[PDB]
Amino acid sequence: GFVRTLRARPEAGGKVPVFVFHPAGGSTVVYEPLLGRLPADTPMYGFERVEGSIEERAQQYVPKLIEMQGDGPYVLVGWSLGGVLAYACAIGLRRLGKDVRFVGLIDAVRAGEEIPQTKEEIRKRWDRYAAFAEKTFNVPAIPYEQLEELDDEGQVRFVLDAVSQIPAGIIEHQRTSYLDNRAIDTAQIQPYDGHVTLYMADRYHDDAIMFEPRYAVRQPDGGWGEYVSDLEVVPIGGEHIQAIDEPIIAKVGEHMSRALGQIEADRT
Template identity: 55%
Template sequence: MLIFHPAGGNTTAYEALVKRLPADVPVIGFDRVEGSIEERVEQYMPKLREIQPHGPYVLVGWSLGGALAYGAAQTLLAAGEEVAFVGLIDVVRPSEDVPDTPENKRARLERWKSFAVKTYGLDENIPVPMDRLVEADDDEQFAIIMEMMAMSDAKIPGGIIEHQRTSFIDNRVLSNIDPTPYDGKVVLYRADKMHDGAIELEPQWAQIDEDGRWGEVVDDLEILHIGGDHLGIVDEPHIAKVAADLGERMKGLKKQ
């Protein structure tokens, strides 16, 4: 089983899952690299093929990790390899896309500013530079956030800043995914809702279709309702349900 890191984190997020899987199920994790989904998958592919030269592949991911698993599956299928299934652990898109207009960019930075004021003591009187936001991409938007923090007396450890950077960039990548049709089996493990923190920063996450919009591109889609929220689904007791299903599917592959 090949697993991919979630937004803003690494594959240690799957510790509870790995502990629940049968001992004879090998699990290989792929941690963070920079770039778009396609660019990251391209970077992963040489090591992935070195570890497992041929299928059937099982690719699993939570959050952004699921988008990476889906992208890797597309690449492997295009190369003529067999993919048994893709497991998406609450990998969803909001019901409605939010265009990246200057007004929406400003609203996004205002929300992040409010988060920083509440969490890190950022000076609430620091202005948001609207003129620079008009042309800013996601990396530049976060650079503006960092400049705003530098103008404040708030002392934020470098590790926390890096975590906020990767979280911001990865979640923007996840919000903007535009998956192409996939001719294979996909299993979607659904939480009941997005977690409150994500909705606070990006309100569109409050409305998510049951299929997370994967039905738009996947015909062979199976949805399993796990419970909890987006953050809690990878922890007990919810992850036990995910692990039990994955374990049974892996057992079925060995019998073939």
Template identity: 40%
Template sequence: MTGALPPIDEATREALARRLSERSGGDITADQLAGASTIAEVADLLRPFTEVAVEGNIRVLAEGQEGRTPLFLFHAAGGSSFVYEPLVERLDEGTPVYGVERVEGPLEARAATYLDRIRELAAGRPVALGGWSFGGALAVEVARQLRAAGDEVSLVVLLDTVQPSEPIPDTLDEAEARWKRYSEFAKRTYGLDVEVPRDFLAEHGEDGVLDMLMGVLGAEANAMGGGVIEHQRASFVDNRILQSADMGSWAGVGAEVPFVLYRAERMHDGAIELEPRYERIDPDGGWAAVVTDLEVVHLEGDHLAMVDEPVVGTVGKHLARRLTELDAGVRKGTNA
């Protein structure tokens, strides 16, 4: 992630600059790329355009039209809603789409912070809620809270939001094994030797260990880039929330709201390395036990392919159809 970039010729730099400008909505030049020696430095060029402050932590990804079902897409682990732009481009241009950005805290508290702004933007319309990976968990929790308050949710969209077939134990032994894997990852990726003593883990918990690790990484901020360090911290926190989420707590909303799960062939290798149980995931991702109306769309490629071509084209085509069906139901006065 932070190592030296391979040399690229001028034509490739110009093509890359154009592509990054298109994807970020910013103005990235070939000269700027020529001055970047690491991926972290390229990320720093993009950050002002992809991590901007937004009102109420929700940004407009597509204005859409009045009367259409608004779609709210929640950030993935440690990331921003910027990742959904390729998907948004493949939806009907009349669909209003909003990107929901990251806040800190437990899952339930995070979801609660979004509710008022979602209601304001929805303007009385039933909403569709979705997200990739951790973003899907946020979407389900927001759906639960909205339904509990009497608000209408017409669809939950999960982009490979899954849990391993084998539950992850909540034990000290398991936490110790997990941090051993993360330590090996830090050594290989960043060249850092980070030992996590069992007694320290038992006394301070995983939050304390994470603070210790971030302190060590912080000393490397100049070489790694502060954004890289924050991404690693936020990704760990968000992924642990997803891994430990109790799907049974969502049975109520699962009985009331249709779900569609876009399911990758497999988890990506990096996630399996950090949590080997992701080697085996049920075809329904664990959702069939709590969702009554569940459509599973099986896709090629791994978890990381969900938001990129060619897979995102398939997702976009199918989701556009589902949203069009919802709009047709609303226009007919049905409770779609």
């Protein structure tokens, strides 16, 4: 289904599992280096891509989380889109009376300026995209009227259909990566009253900034302060793309290992 077992929990008992959520355009295999930097016998399960708005995705994840972990305690972690997903699940779990003890955002940083969801923005985005298409491929008027009334999924299907009028593996990977990135853009963040740990790199990587220049700037709280009063930021430096890998992930893992140790002691 959509649950990957990175490290299975014992048949009974054992430590609290870490649930990780996939990043934009990738799977949860990317959390293996993190897993290497967490305490021994820490179980880990990864939740992979599902369809819908952030809230719709969480509506699919949360029942599964509960089936696997019951009342809690819940440790929810994510890099890239995975961060927003972990957070949405945190809100859903807390609303149903569950015990969420840790939410780990791994450089899941909001654009430094809000990205509006307006028809003007739709037009600016696709104008930007058309221009790069011209330059990258050495190659007309953009049918804005039809695009404005399509959602993101509809917009890319329209552009891809108009394009064919490229092999499927490549189209599918560009498609889901594009939609997962837009899901980050259009996420409507709700407030959460539990503790959030935000691991913060210095900047988005250049390719990220080229697609959406508002990611060139980040606030110090990464845009989460207004939604999260109990917010901790753990600066890790480097770029967004590097935050998930060795050696920077060692810094994340060392800190996160301390948090897990406290959760384990409290149960004891």
